[PDB]
Ligand binder design. Structure first.
Ligand SMILES: *[C@@H]1O[C@H](CO)[C@@H](O[C@@H]2O[C@H](CO)[C@@H](O)[C@H](O)[C@H]2NC(C)=O)[C@H](O)[C@H]1NC(C)=O
Ligand SMILES: OC[C@@H]1O[C@@H](O[C@H]2[C@H](O[C@@H]3CO[C@@H](O)[C@H](O)[C@H]3O)OC[C@@H](O)[C@@H]2O)[C@H](O)[C@H]1O
Ligand SMILES: OC[C@@H]1O[C@@H](O[C@H]2[C@H](O[C@@H]3CO[C@@H](O)[C@H](O)[C@H]3O)OC[C@@H](O)[C@@H]2O)[C@H](O)[C@H]1O
Length: 482
């Protein structure tokens, strides 16, 4: 049996079921999600390898070879047609065309479920999916349940990384017009114990960690690499349950009456489904979604425990984020441009500006150093890397407003994430392509001899598809600084 089979057995059936990693029904073999490669913009779908099995990743790899990929649709396996597609603008605008949110990369969250490779939805700030005309989802004060397997080490404090019931207009229509899972360390509304992140329930104009608005000590910080967040709401009652999605039981962080504030009882749910964003399209949060569902009816604890066990059985394990040449901590290198007509340039810098310059044996020692980089263990992820300036030790290459700048490590998480890159086999076949860890849809890319964290097409001029593959491919060579 799969998650939804278990929920059906408990009389609180899935009315929405999403996952880019596995089928949530033992008998599902349809499409899990849709892809679109930047090369020609064509699409293809990825289905389980077998009925009720794991996603066919090799098919994605084949289709996305020598190019980039975005996850255009996350199909609803329940049959209700509640697929998730690019989230539209609302109270707030998205950073994409006409205010839509960004689609997520297809390779930002690699994992294996019991030895079988799969891909999750790595969402960076500005990313988001939605369905404002869903069927079967709870409305008004009707009971519902939900859960999602997320990455407890990928999150921030901006509003709002949710998954659940939201407004059909994409605007904040008031308290009680929402009921969704939230995971992050925002403290603007509710928050629990510790540094975070905390699993809270977004009920509109409030992320609740318990009965009271704001602080509630009963909600602990949960930072497992794989987290199961189980939330449910009914007639003047709701609950929060969390667990290590890779081992053990669900613990109950809250169970009881609605917050005693106007608008929260009875609730006024609207039935829309959001992912990675807030109800009014607040899109500054980040996170990773692997699988999740929404149900009709208040799931019993026994039902959720069975689900949790099934998830544990799925055996989630982190996959490799790196491919191609790759580096070793402490190694000193120089990165050469492979784009025809600039093949003698190297990634260097002029103050905080990271650019490409012609560097050779006649170059001064200062320029040789500006073009030499000490590779160190990724500041935000131990699998990837960070590039430290040879001439200016203590400073690293980081993306700011999508430009690559050479700034000093200020020890903050933000800096750490803006300075972590993952080696990927060069797209043009020559060398490596440094993929941004926090923004997997972006790579090191030179545009008019300046370095940006560019995507294959986008709202910034430096995201041009023209010569993209070449501009994101570099040959790893012996450092000039010897
Ligand atoms: C969420 O957690 C992060 C990481 O613990 C907090 O970030 C720090 O941010 C402050 C305010 O910008 C800086 O003084 C610190 O140097 C940062 N520390 C680290 C370790 O990054 C962030 O403030 C927390 N957010 C909330 C709302 O509590
Ligand atoms: O390199 C991208 C981010 O720029 C810096 O943040 C600045 C922020 O940027 C927004 C970040 O979120 C994206 O979704 C938006 O598309 C982008 O505009 O704009 C306001 C500035 O005051 C922030 O410093 C971050 O350092 C970096 O991660
Ligand atoms: O990053 C180097 C190349 O820039 C982009 O090229 C475009 C070219 O840009 C020139 C880049 O070099 C500066 O010194 C020049 O002042 C500037 O004109 O302009 C014409 C466009 O058609 C080129 O694509 C390429 O993307 C990149 O390889």
């Amino acid at each position: 049996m799969g998650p939804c089979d278990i929920y059906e057995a408990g009389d609180t059936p899935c009315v929405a079921a999403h996952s880019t990693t596995r089928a949530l029904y033992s008998s599902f073999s349809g499409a899990l999600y849709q892809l679109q490669r930047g090369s020609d913009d064509t699409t293809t779908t990825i289905s389980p390898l077998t009925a009720g099995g794991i996603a066919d990743a090799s098919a994605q790899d084949t289709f996305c070879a020598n190019t980039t990929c975005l996850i255009t649709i996350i199909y609803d396996q329940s049959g209700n047609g509640n697929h998730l597609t690019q989230a539209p603008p609302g109270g707030f605008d998205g950073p994409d065309t006409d205010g839509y949110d960004n689609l997520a990369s297809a390779i930002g969250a690699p994992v294996t479920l019991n030895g079988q490779k799969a891909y999750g939805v790595f969402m960076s700030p500005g990313t988001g999916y939605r369905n404002n005309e869903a069927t079967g989802t709870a409305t008004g004060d009707e009971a519902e349940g939900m859960y999602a397997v997320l990455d407890g080490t990928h999150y921030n404090d901006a509003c709002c990384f949710d998954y659940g019931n939201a407004e059909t207009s994409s605007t904040d229509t008031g308290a009680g017009h929402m009921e969704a899972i939230y995971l992050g360390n925002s403290t603007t509304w509710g928050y629990g114990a510790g540094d975070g992140p905390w699993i809270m329930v977004d009920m509109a104009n409030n992320l609740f960690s318990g009965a009271d608005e704001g602080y509630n000590s009963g909600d602990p910080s949960i930072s497992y690499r794989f987290v199961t967040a189980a939330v449910k709401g009914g007639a003047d009652k709701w609950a929060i349950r969390g667990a290590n999605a890779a081992s053990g039981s669900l613990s109950t962080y809250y169970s009881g009456a609605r917050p005693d504030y106007s608008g929260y009882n009875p609730m006024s749910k609207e039935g829309a489904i959001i992912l990675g964003i807030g109800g009014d399209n607040s899109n500054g949060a980040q996170g990773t979604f692997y699988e999740g569902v929404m149900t009709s009816g208040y799931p019993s604890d026994d039902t959720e425990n069975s689900v949790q066990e099934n998830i544990v059985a799925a055996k989630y394990v982190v996959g490799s984020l790196v491919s191609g040449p790759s580096f070793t901590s402490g190694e000193v290198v120089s990165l050469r441009v492979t784009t025809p007509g600039y093949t003698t340039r190297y990634i260097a810098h002029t103050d905080t500006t990271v650019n490409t310059q012609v560097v050779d044996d006649d170059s001064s020692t200062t320029l040789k150093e500006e073009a030499s980089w000490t590779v160190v263990t990724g500041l935000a992820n131990s699998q990837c890397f960070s590039f430290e300036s040879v001439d200016t030790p203590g400073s690293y290459i980081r993306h700011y407003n999508f430009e690559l700048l050479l700034n000093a490590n200020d020890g903050t998480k933000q800096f750490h994430e803006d300075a972590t890159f993952c080696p990927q086999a060069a797209l043009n076949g020559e060398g490596t392509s440094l993929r941004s860890w926090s923004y997997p849809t972006r790579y090191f890319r030179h545009y008019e001899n300046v370095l940006y964290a560019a995507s294959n097409g986008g709202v910034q001029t430096f995201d041009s598809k023209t010569s993209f593959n070449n501009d994101v491919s570099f040959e790893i060579e012996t450092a000039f600084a010897s």
